[PDB]
């Protein structure tokens, strides 16, 4: 299905071309379930932890976002005791151009910059607000407490095709050409285009569909 | 300029994959003025004739289109006695997608299939019509007085015809970054040079700039 090619082809760019800190992939051999890994981000408070957390791919996947918790407990404004995060690009702005690499990436980010005016627990992100030195503090020992313990030739062939098809293929399925174009600049392919009303790059709904020969 | 980096690039491209019945290239060091040289096709009565003719690329080559004549005499509907050629391909049906291998081929396709729809001869144009065995007698004997004087890894290279695809057909060295209502695109430079789309011949209608 699109979704499951779509998850061997995220996990062959995760392996090929690792992230220096996160890491995701399937725990067993059910693809639409995977773990992920991050570490603490060096210049925040949960700089030393390993958090671990659960993604679950839908059935329609990227047309639809995947479902990622928490399973290491953390002291922050927009994740709760179980683990749920309150991310924009897990709800309203998930497009279908985000990959999971992107989404561990934007959580690292959530955890460096939180936004304690949309929390899931209104007492730290009170605390956030108000006394960011003690917010730090307590953030610093939940981490301690819960998230620690001829080749020349075919090489250069190789990277032309490569940078070739990191500029022409579709940024949805990352898997045929971009035969389709809205006048907003941006394009997919048709299978993946013919399946959203709103493009992928810039959200700017799709006027008009012309097909590439 | 444009015109000498594609004169360069279709000379290359003619010495990487040669066309079987035709052969051209540089008289000397001038470029823009070719020498070529067309096989008798075996399918019609200028077979075992060797002809030659002159090429001459304007100097905003290729979207305007260059000059071919022949210097052999040839008995021949759309070709007349000073070696010019009524032949859409080098004027109405121009693009500048076009190159010279193309051309050069339907001028052996076209002394396959002369057209006496609107032709440069009319004489012998009516007497094609009319006495195609006597055409091909004086369109032979004419023949005979003047025109007798690695892999295992190249999948990639194969593959690499992705840009036949992707890349602008007008200068075959960028990427197509501006797209036409009629589906098809250029560069961004050769587009906003052309008022049709090279490939399909629409109006251009409308640029759409790609990212
Ligand atoms: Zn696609
Ligand atoms: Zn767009
Ligand atoms: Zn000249
Ligand atoms: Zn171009
Ligand atoms: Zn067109």
Not at 48 to 53: I, K, R
Not at 55 to 70: G, L, M, S
Not at 143 to 168: F, H, P, R, S
Request: glycine share 4%; net charge positive; charged share 20%.
């Amino acid at each position: 299905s699109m979704a499951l090619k779509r998850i061997h082809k995220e996990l062959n760019d995760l392996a090929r071309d690792p992230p220096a800190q996160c890491s995701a992939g399937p725990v067993g051999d059910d693809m639409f379930h995977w773990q992920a890994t991050i570490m603490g981000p060096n210049d925040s408070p949960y700089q030393g932890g390993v958090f671990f957390l659960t993604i679950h791919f839908p059935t329609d996947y990227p047309f639809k976002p995947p479902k990622v918790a928490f399973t290491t407990r953390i002291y922050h404004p927009n994740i709760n005791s179980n683990g749920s995060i309150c991310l924009d690009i897990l709800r309203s702005q998930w497009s279908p151009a985000l990959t999971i690499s992107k989404v561990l990436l934007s959580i690292c980010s959530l955890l460096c910059d939180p936004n304690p005016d949309d929390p899931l627990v209104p007492e730290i992100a009170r605390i956030y607000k108000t006394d960011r030195e003690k917010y730090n503090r307590i953030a610093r020992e939940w981490t301690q407490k819960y998230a620690m313990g001829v080749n020349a030739d075919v090489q250069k062939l190789q990277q032309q095709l490569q940078d070739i098809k990191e500029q022409t293929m579709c940024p949805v399925c990352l898997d045929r050409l971009k035969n389709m174009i809205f006048l907003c600049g941006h394009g997919t392919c048709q299978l993946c285009g013919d399946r959203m009303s709103e493009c992928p790059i810039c959200r700017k709904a799709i006027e008009r569909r012309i097909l590439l020969y």
